[PDB]
Amino acid sequence: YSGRDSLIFLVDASKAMFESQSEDELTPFDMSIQCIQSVYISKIISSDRDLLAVVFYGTEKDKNSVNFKNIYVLQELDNPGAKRILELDQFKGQQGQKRFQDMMGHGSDYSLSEVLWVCANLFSDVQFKMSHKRIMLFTNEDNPHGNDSAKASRARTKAGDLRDTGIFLDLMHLKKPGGFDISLFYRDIISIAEDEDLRVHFEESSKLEDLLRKVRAKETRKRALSRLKLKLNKDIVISVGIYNLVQKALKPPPIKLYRETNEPVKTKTRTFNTSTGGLLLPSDTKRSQIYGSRQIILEKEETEELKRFDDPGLMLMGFKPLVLLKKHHYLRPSLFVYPEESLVIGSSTLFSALLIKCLEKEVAALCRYTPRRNIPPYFVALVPQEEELDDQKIQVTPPGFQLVFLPFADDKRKMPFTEKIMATPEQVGKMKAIVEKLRFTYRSDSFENPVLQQHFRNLEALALDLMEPEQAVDLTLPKVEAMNKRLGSLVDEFKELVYPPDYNPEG
Amino acid sequence: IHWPCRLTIGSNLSIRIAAYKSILQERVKKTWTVVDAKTLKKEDIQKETVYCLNDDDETEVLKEDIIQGFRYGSDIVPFSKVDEEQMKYKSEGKCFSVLGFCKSSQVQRRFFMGNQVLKVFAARDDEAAAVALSSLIHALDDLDMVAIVRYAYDKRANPQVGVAFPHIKHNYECLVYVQLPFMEDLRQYMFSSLKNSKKYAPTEAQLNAVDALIDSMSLAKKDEKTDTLEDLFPTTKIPNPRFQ
């Protein structure tokens, strides 16, 4: 998967789309606008390098390269930004609907062939490589052309041509007074006709709920940190790739701006002599360190050369039982090692054999690891990792090796000596009861970083000039009320059984 | 440095605890100092940073006329530092709370994050706290479960969600705390399956050769008299070659 994903939001501008079934309900047009805005915000937060477009059909005015009738391309394929969101915001309400009607109009005819032609033309203009081509149809008219059959045939032919080109088509059908029926006309235009998507739907599509669900977490495409060589010995070498399945998420780096006109500035660092005033490059100056009441002077090149031990890669040392590995010896986040057949042919077979035998014998490969040049070596353990799938066969644990760093003698710290006091069985039983009362299931994606979420919310509020920032609920805060209700009296019994009458833990 | 805090389970149970850092990546105590080649003095070298605009004159601007900004899509949104502090996420610092308890199986080592391991003992010169912590540790070990907890070093430190699991030895017992990942940190990468590959399937002879290699290169000796494993190559007892 290489390139960018392009999406086009086709929104019908027919009269039937501007009628609300109930007074306290959202019109289909407003729902489509809200979905587009949500997708825009999600793309800005997650993938800012993607391309989006917004096109309307069935209007009175037109704006397109080919100069068709009743097709107004509101926004062409361009990276998302706050300006487009603000522009779309002027159609959200009823006054926005009036503004949209005045600007473009509604109630005119249209031909789906022209719409698809305009979409294809928009796709062709983009110069960047596009991994995905996608179009979404926000409409509530299952029979766009019932009076004319030639128009339907032309639309079918254009949809087929687009499908052959490699353009995905999706139908976000909206509520209809009568009921949407895909079988009428949209069975062929839509790229994939699901078996369940054949009955008459009396409610908006379920995909709108997914679209409205804002995702405020960055998405990174698969990439290899390094492509190194595993050396069983001097003459047996295979090629492996290293990946970081877990990586800390950081706020985007701040940028320095000028106060007067918000124009970015450039920061430069320089070093000058005090007694002469001249400028010194980072080669005239030396390095120093005061040991034993004396000064030791080393050049920069020598200082860098102090760290040269061995060439980059992994060197095999032996195999160790997994029992000897310790959980509390954590030093650094682990990495993932996978075969890489491009550099060396035959690496995959040996890697698979090693993984199978390591799983069978429950052993881990001890290795010496050197990520880059002029970096001191470390001792790592490659633990086999089998392929684990979930109920729906979606892979949850890939096959390969888990690279875990092992601490040196300097990475451990001595602990103060503390006398051991053992609790009586009754206290342990009461604590067991409390623990059982406070039991819950844990998942790796059950928590979110409050700082990053609040930062994203504040940034969006500032960019869109919203009245107040949206407040993010913190799921990491203990539920004091629920815990108190569940525990009941157990806390009092434990405190009576473990603490003297006058202890005052807080004090 | 001894770090005092209170392990809280709800709003009525609290145990005074002291936390230390057990495992961390050691660094050099002293750093190289830049000196002048001729006089060999640090007083003759001065480093300073300046800011200038992207103009032919490259006019300089003082630090009082410099604002912060961020990238929101295709445009830059100003965000002054004072406004950022006004809108920053505020939390009560120095918290050690028990979010819940979960089976040790659910928490896997491959998900461990952070750059340190914390060892939590009872407060010094405190018997009731020691009894409470021992009860908690023994209950967790007997039930084979760990505690998902929220940890914050201080007011300025960002909150973290981590796992505390018991550590019992013949002479001392304590809790071991290691950070856990957030939803953002997780990465979803898809890799092909090697078991069901018709092109990389090992043969019987290849598997036998790999088995022989694994058996011959064993780094542990199994003494049958004591039925014990002895490590022929202890990595944890090797000084770092960098400092040497």
Partner: peptide, 23 residues
């Protein structure tokens, strides 16, 4: 390929974080 993220093709959709839900 059920569960694929509509917003981001090629990435598996992630369920909303539920925090702690006692049994």
């Amino acid at each position: 390929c059920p569960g694929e993220s509509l917003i981001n093709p090629g990435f598996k959709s992630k369920k909303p974080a539920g925090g702690v839900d006692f049994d």
